[PDB]
Design a protein around this ligand. Structure first.
Ligand code: CLA
Ligand code: CLA
Ligand code: CLA
Ligand code: CLA
Ligand code: CLA
Ligand SMILES: CC(C)=CCC/C(C)=C/CC/C(C)=C/CC/C(C)=C/CC/C(C)=C/CC/C(C)=C/CC/C(C)=C/CC/C(C)=C/CC/C(C)=C/CC1=CC(=O)C(C)=C(C)C1=O
Ligand SMILES: CCCCCCCCCCCCCCCCCC(=O)OC[C@H](CO[C@@H]1O[C@H](CO)[C@H](O)[C@H](O)[C@H]1O)OC(=O)CCCCCCCCCCCCCCCCC
Ligand SMILES: CCCCCCCCCCCCCCCCCC(=O)OC[C@H](CO[C@@H]1O[C@H](CO)[C@H](O)[C@H](O)[C@H]1O)OC(=O)CCCCCCCCCCCCCCCCC
Ligand SMILES: CCCCCCCCCCCCCCCC(=O)OC[C@H](CO[C@@H]1O[C@H](CS(=O)(=O)O)[C@@H](O)[C@H](O)[C@H]1O)OC(=O)CCCCCCCCCCCCCCC
Ligand SMILES: CCCCCCCCCCCCCCCC(=O)OC[C@H](COP(=O)(O)OC[C@@H](O)CO)OC(=O)CCCCCCCCCCCCCCC
Ligand code: OEX
Ligand SMILES: [Fe+2]
Lengths: 38, 52, 334, 245, 42, 35, 50, 30, 42
């Protein structure tokens, strides 16, 4: 190895942006399912 | 020809030059350190710690 | 200073990630070739004439199998005991038909496992350890060489060798039962006692240590965090677990010595698998197990059945059905 | 030859020599006697070809692609006996005994394995003239038996003269008036006999040694596994050798 | 007749990206409970 | 098929010679006791 | 404190890990083209190329 | 189509064997 | 002929429990980076 990277950061996702990203996936799953099942 | 009674499976003459250049190419590496040493230096141990 | 001494210093260095050693010079090229041919022959390999009757048995995943049924098929009955490498096969298509990769995998396996065993010796020498972990590993090496090497020798063909698979294992065990009667043989009896006893004393020793652990944690965190690595304090009250088992059976049946205790855990399985692997070996040369068929008679002389006669009728069912086309003559001499 | 007969058994084995027919030396004529009986006719093919649908530039006419044999050295026929009867117009041969079948398997492009029984059973040869000459050329029909004798058991355990006759691990197929008649073809095992046409051609004779030998060409039909598939036409070529006595 | 690879498209198109976005939230709340130093940091 | 065969006898007696001349390289003296 | 759409900007001031990342996109592109072409040979049928 | 799942389970099992050997949590004294 | 509900059994039997065990590890390392207070806690 070498030394520890000084470019370590942390990732954040608040409770607000969770519900956006969940609803984004389910609505795209509702929309595109009917075409994939054909 | 499988069940021929030939030495080390050496079917053709070309496979010998493979064997001789394999043992000798590492033998010559080995003689670069353990060769050209004193063949007349003993010990009364069970194990020798002479040199490299 | 020399190039060889700077290479011997690296190849015997314990400062490597994995110790290579001088046995790794022929462990690693052998086992990586047994591996890289096994993954290809298990996934994509055409069917193989095993019975020598030109009825090719599918064994790979691309030819409609699964994890259970798929298997690297042993070599042909037509080859038998002959050495069959790739260069003595005149094409790879002729090699894969006649059971090619079974000999390439097995022979590079038994060299690599007998070199993995010597490698366990070597690092014990360079670390200051007492040497004999590799003697305990002799017991599965004895058993691997019994079903892949010794049993094809005494039966005269690699086709009787063990198929590298899961359903092929149970084709091997049942046909070995009908032709050799392994269950009545006292060396399979001495290793069933080796692994029933081995799994007993494993879970019996592992419970008495975990029973007598010392308080070093709270009830919220894990039990295992009361052991700091490399500590010098003993992590369990061994007097406590001795007084428990000294009352659970009686007093004199308990090892107070932890060294003699941890030796008996290594004795019992390993001796049980040395003896068992020399059961397959002595039954490779058709010295079968016991045969008590028609042993109990009345005074009139009529045969009174026993449990061995019921066991015989199970052996007669597998004997008349194994290799149902390969036989032409009334006695399975092979 | 007699050169092969010089050797002992330990010098031939493992060398692939016993597979190969002899090489006759020289050319002359030999006359078949009234009681003339053919002694050591061996046939060995040197090339194989299976009739397929070939991928030409734009067309798909049927052509022969060749193939690689996969059973190793087990293809040669040997020890084929038979009397040579003299019809007036043309000399004839009818084989009687000897090893006259050699089962083998060749592989196509694509990975398809085509087994076929290579045989000369019940051969009626007819050739121009009376005496064997370097221009002599005889041939005729032979009967191919099936590749499997009827007591062969398939993976389910079904044969023509033994075994079951239904899908033994599918017990709900024989329910109803129809039964299992949807898979009827894979239950009925039919022994099949087809025809084959070999064409031999003598070109080198010894009369001082009474042994002939030349090039043949044989066509026949591959196997079907008792009606499991459509058999395919198999052409082969090679060399033979015979002792005319 | 529907395509049987569409069940694998939809139910992994739901679950695999949605279980991803849950993970970025759980480690967000763990860092906030990590710095806070009381009863949950450990 | 006689070109592959040449390649194997190279690779075998390469590593076999590393094994043979490995233990001839004063191998008992390579212990953590002394030297 | 990076948002989820800025997580891969830790490689801006790090050339040594700029390569290890660009090698990992390469190991996925090359592993695709190998495993796609293995998938296509199990599906291809050279019976009639016309 | 069926054997594609079996292959993915096998090489996926060999991945986590690779990461467990080389990326192991190295134990340390003190 | 195979059962087409087995693809949903296996590929969710892999992914759903295996993505679960990843989450318990990521929040474990986030709590350790949360308490540590340097460059990653936030
Ligand atoms: C280095 C480890 C190693 C070892 C031990 C083997 C061993 C073997 N391989 Mg393998 N192989 C290896 C690496 C290895 N392989 C690698 C890295 C590859 C990838 C290229 C292959 C690829 C490969 C293929 C593709 C095939 C083999 C095959 C074989 C077998 C026969 C090969 C042969 O003729 O050996 C040559 C051996 C010798 C000439 C003998 C050397 C022994 C020396 C001389 C020591 C003896 C000392 C002597 C007795 C002292 C006498 C003193 C005197 C005074 C009397 C054999 C089991 C074949 C096989 O298994 O087919 C079934 C086969 O087809 N191998
Ligand atoms: C089954 C494998 C095996 C293993 C793991 C060991 C392990 C050991 N042997 Mg040993 N040995 C064996 C078989 C084995 N032996 C056999 C069969 C013989 C008789 C030929 C010997 C003769 C022998 C002597 C004379 C010495 C050792 C020594 C040692 C120790 C150090 C390793 C060393 O330098 O030996 C080198 C390794 C060998 C000699 C055997 C290599 C075995 C290979 C890896 C696998 C088996 C292949 C087969 C036997 C070779 C056939 C070749 C042929 C096909 C061409 C170690 C405990 C040394 C020691 O410490 O003694 C105190 C020592 O001086 N062994
Ligand atoms: C209650 C039932 C019972 C029990 C407990 C046993 C117990 C046993 N039977 Mg037995 N048997 C039974 C019923 C039973 N039998 C019945 C009913 C039959 C008749 C069908 C048989 C027929 C039978 C046969 C025919 C055989 C046994 C054998 C054995 C032994 C197996 C141990 C073994 O092979 O490990 C030893 C370990 C190995 C073989 C593995 C070696 C693996 C090497 C060292 C390394 C492999 C590494 C691997 C490739 C990769 C590692 C992981 C990787 C990711 C790194 C054991 C004593 C076998 C035997 O006698 O011993 C040989 C045997 O051949 N039995
Ligand atoms: C009902 C319970 C039971 C019991 C008591 C046994 C007992 C036995 N089985 Mg068995 N078995 C069982 C269930 C049982 N089995 C089941 C459910 C199966 C699977 C279907 C098998 C399958 C099986 C196979 C396949 C084999 C056995 C064998 C054996 C024998 C040795 C096993 C051994 O040493 O294990 C290891 C355990 C120990 C070493 C602990 C000690 C066990 C002994 C018997 C108790 C000692 C107490 C002593 C007699 C009392 C005096 C002491 C006193 C002074 C305090 C032994 C007679 C083997 C055999 O045939 O041997 C002849 C054998 O081959 N069994
Ligand atoms: C050559 C290609 C390339 C490269 C190397 C980058 C590199 C970068 N972009 Mg950029 N970008 C690109 C193309 C590229 N971009 C394109 C084409 C667009 C238009 C869509 C954008 C739009 C864009 C925006 C709007 C932003 C960036 C940002 C960034 C930086 C961080 C990326 C990040 O955090 O994402 C992390 C991403 C994730 C954690 C998950 C993303 C999930 C995606 C949406 C779906 C999954 C991807 C899918 C599997 C890919 C299939 C392959 C397909 C590309 C063929 C980084 C310097 C950010 C920036 O400016 O840095 C401060 C930013 O805010 N990019
Ligand atoms: C008066 C009237 C009415 C008349 C009728 C007469 C009458 C009263 C009759 C009744 C009498 C009657 C039958 C009573 C007898 C009672 C009796 C014994 C009945 C039970 C019957 C029976 C079959 C018993 C025999 C079975 C038995 C219990 C066998 C014991 C087996 C045995 C000896 C095992 C030892 C195995 C062993 C060596 C284990 C140690 C190895 C091991 C790894 C242990 C782990 C371990 C051990 C340690 O040591 C310590 C330290 C630690 C750390 C540790 O890990
Ligand atoms: C993390 C998420 C993981 C899931 C990814 C979700 C993606 C879902 C969408 C792709 C799946 C939908 C395919 C239909 C399912 C189906 O059964 O198909 C099944 C078909 C395969 O088709 C099957 O094939 C078999 C033999 O091949 C047999 O013939 C079957 O009969 C036939 O159905 O699969 C596909 O078509 C997969 C295609 C995926 C690649 C997409 C190519 C197009 C991409 C263009 C990119 C443009 C993007 C621009 C940006 C916008
Ligand atoms: C998180 C993981 C989420 C996935 C769960 C994974 C579980 C996988 C195992 C269950 C799925 C396997 C079913 C086969 C798939 C298939 O296609 O089936 C498909 C069948 C349905 O069958 C379909 O039915 C249709 C009409 O109903 C049509 O008839 C179809 O032809 C027919 O195939 O589904 C099941 O059988 C699901 C059963 C699940 C319930 C299990 C009941 C038994 C439980 C006993 C519990 C004992 C446990 C004791 C502890 C041990
Ligand atoms: C009708 C014929 C009658 C029988 C005839 C005899 C035939 C041959 C019998 C062979 C006897 C061999 C004696 C070996 C002694 C020995 O091992 O000591 C090793 C130590 C020494 O004891 C330890 O010894 C130490 C004292 S000292 O070393 O002994 O001085 C002490 O510190 C320690 O506490 C103590 O545990 O003992 C132990 O650690 C316990 C293991 C005992 C093993 C013996 C049982 C036999 C093997 C099990 C059966 C096979 C297993 C597989 C079965 C499938
Ligand atoms: C092969 C591997 C497959 C990889 C797939 C994995 C990635 C998949 C998921 C990533 C995308 C996640 C999007 C997160 C979403 C997210 O977290 O939002 C938050 C994000 C930015 O938020 P901030 O900058 O406030 O973030 C602060 C940080 O603390 C957290 O981000 O917003 C966006 O990036 C743009 C807004 C998109 C928000 C969606 C808007 C559309 C609303 C939904 C519309 C549907 C309803 C329609 C009704 C008609
Ligand atoms: O190869 Mn496999 O199994 Ca031994 O027995 Mn004889 O050979 Mn065949 O029969 Mn039975
Ligand atoms: Fe212990």
């Amino acid at each position: 190895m070498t030394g520890p990277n000084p470019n370590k950061q942390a990732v954040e996702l608040n409770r607000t942006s969770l519900y956006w990203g969940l609803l984004l996936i389910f609505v795209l799953a509702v929309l595109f399912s009917s075409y994939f099942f054909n | 020809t499988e069940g021929t009674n030939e030495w080390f499976g050496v079917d053709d003459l070309r496979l010998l030059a493979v064997l001789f250049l394999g043992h000798w190419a590492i033998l010559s590496l080995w003689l670069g350190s353990y060769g050209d040493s004193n063949e007349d230096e003993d010990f009364f141990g069970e194990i020798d710690y002479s040199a490299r | 200073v020399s190039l060889w001494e700077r290479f011997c210093a690296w190849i015997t260095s314990t400062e490597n990630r994995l110790y290579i050693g001088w046995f790794g010079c022929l462990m690693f090229p052998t086992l990586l070739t047994a591996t890289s041919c096994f993954i290809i022959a298990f996934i994509a390999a055409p069917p193989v004439d095993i019975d020598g009757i030109r009825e090719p048995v599918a064994g790979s995943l691309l030819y409609g199998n699964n994890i259970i049924s798929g298997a690297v098929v042993p070599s042909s009955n037509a080859i038998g005991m002959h050495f069959y490498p790739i260069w003595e096969a005149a094409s790879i298509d002729e090699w894969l038909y006649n059971g090619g990769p079974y000999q390439l995998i097995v022979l590079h396996f038994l060299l690599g496992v007998s070199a993995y065993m010597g490698r366990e010796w070597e690092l014990s020498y360079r670390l200051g350890m007492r040497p004999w972990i590799f003697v305990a590993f002799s017991a599965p090496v004895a058993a691997a060489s019994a079903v892949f090497l010794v049993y094809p020798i005494g039966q005269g063909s690699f086709s009787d060798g063990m198929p590298l698979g899961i359903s092929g294992t149970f084709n091997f065990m049942l046909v070995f039962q009908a032709e050799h009667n392994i269950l009545m043989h006292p060396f399979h009896m001495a290793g069933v006692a080796g692994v029933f006893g081995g799994s007993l004393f494993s879970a019996m020793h592992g419970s008495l240590v975990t029973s007598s652990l010392i308080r070093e944690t709270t009830e919220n965190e894990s039990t295992n965090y009361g052991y700091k690595f490399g500590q010098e304090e003993e992590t369990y009250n061994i007097v406590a677990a001795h007084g428990y088992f000294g009352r659970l059976i009686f007093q004199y049946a308990s090892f107070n010595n932890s060294r003699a205790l941890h030796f008996f855990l290594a004795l019992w399985p390993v001796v049980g698998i040395w003896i068992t692997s020399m059961g397959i070996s002595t039954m490779a040369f058709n010295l079968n197990g016991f045969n008590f068929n028609q042993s109990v008679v009345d005074s009139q002389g009529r045969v009174i059945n026993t449990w061995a006669d019921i066991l015989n009728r199970a052996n007669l069912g597998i004997e008349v059905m194994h290799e149902r086309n390969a036989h032409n003559f009334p006695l399975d001499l092979a | 030859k007699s050169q092969i007969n010089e050797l002992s058994y330990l010098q031939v084995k493992g060398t692939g020599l016993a597979n190969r027919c002899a090489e006759v030396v020289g050319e002359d004529s030999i006359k078949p006697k009234p009681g003339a009986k053919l002694v050591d006719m061996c046939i060995e093919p040197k090339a194989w070809a299976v009739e397929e649908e070939v991928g030409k530039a734009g067309k798909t006419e049927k052509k022969f692609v060749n193939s690689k044999v996969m059973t190793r050295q087990t293809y040669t026929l040997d020890a084929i006996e038979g009397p040579i009867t003299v019809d007036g117009g043309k000399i004839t041969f009818n084989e009687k005994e000897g090893i006259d079948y050699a089962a083998t398997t060749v592989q196509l492009p694509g990975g398809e394995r085509v087994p076929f029984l290579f045989t000369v059973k019940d051969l009626v040869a007819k050739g121009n003239g009376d005496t064997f000459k370097p221009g002599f050329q005889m041939g005729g029909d032979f009967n191919t038996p099936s590749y499997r004798t009827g007591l062969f058991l398939d993976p389910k355990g079904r044969g023509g003269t033994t075994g079951y006759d239904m899908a033994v691990a599918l017990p709900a197929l024989q329910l109803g008036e129809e039964g299992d008649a949807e898979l009827f073809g894979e239950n009925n095992k039919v022994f099949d006999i087809t025809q084959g046409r070999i064409e031999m051609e003598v070109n080198k004779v010894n009369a001082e040694d009474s042994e002939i030998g030349g090039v043949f060409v044989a066509t026949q039909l591959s196997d079907t596994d008792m009606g499991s598939k459509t058999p395919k036409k198999v052409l082969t070529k090679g060399i033979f050798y015979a002792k005319v006595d | 007749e529907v395509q049987f690879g569409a069940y694998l498209a939809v139910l992994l198109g739901t679950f695999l990206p949605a279980l991803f976005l849950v993970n970025l939230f759980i480690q967000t709340e763990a860092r906030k409970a990590g710095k806070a130093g009381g009863q949950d940091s450990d | 098929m006689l070109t592959l065969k040449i390649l194997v006898y190279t690779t075998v007696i390469f590593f076999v010679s590393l094994f043979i001349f490995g233990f001839l390289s004063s191998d008992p003296s390579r212990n953590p006791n002394r030297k | 404190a990076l948002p989820w759409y800025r997580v891969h900007t830790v490689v801006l001031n790090d050339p040594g890990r700029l390569i290890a990342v660009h090698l990992m996109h390469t190991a996925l592109v090359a592993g695709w083209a190998g495993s796609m072409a293995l998938y296509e040979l199990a599906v291809f049928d050279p019976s009639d190329p016309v | 189509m069926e054997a594609l799942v079996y292959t993915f389970l096998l090489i996926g099992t060999l991945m986590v064997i690779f990461f467990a050997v080389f990326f192991r949590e190295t134990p340390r004294i003190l």
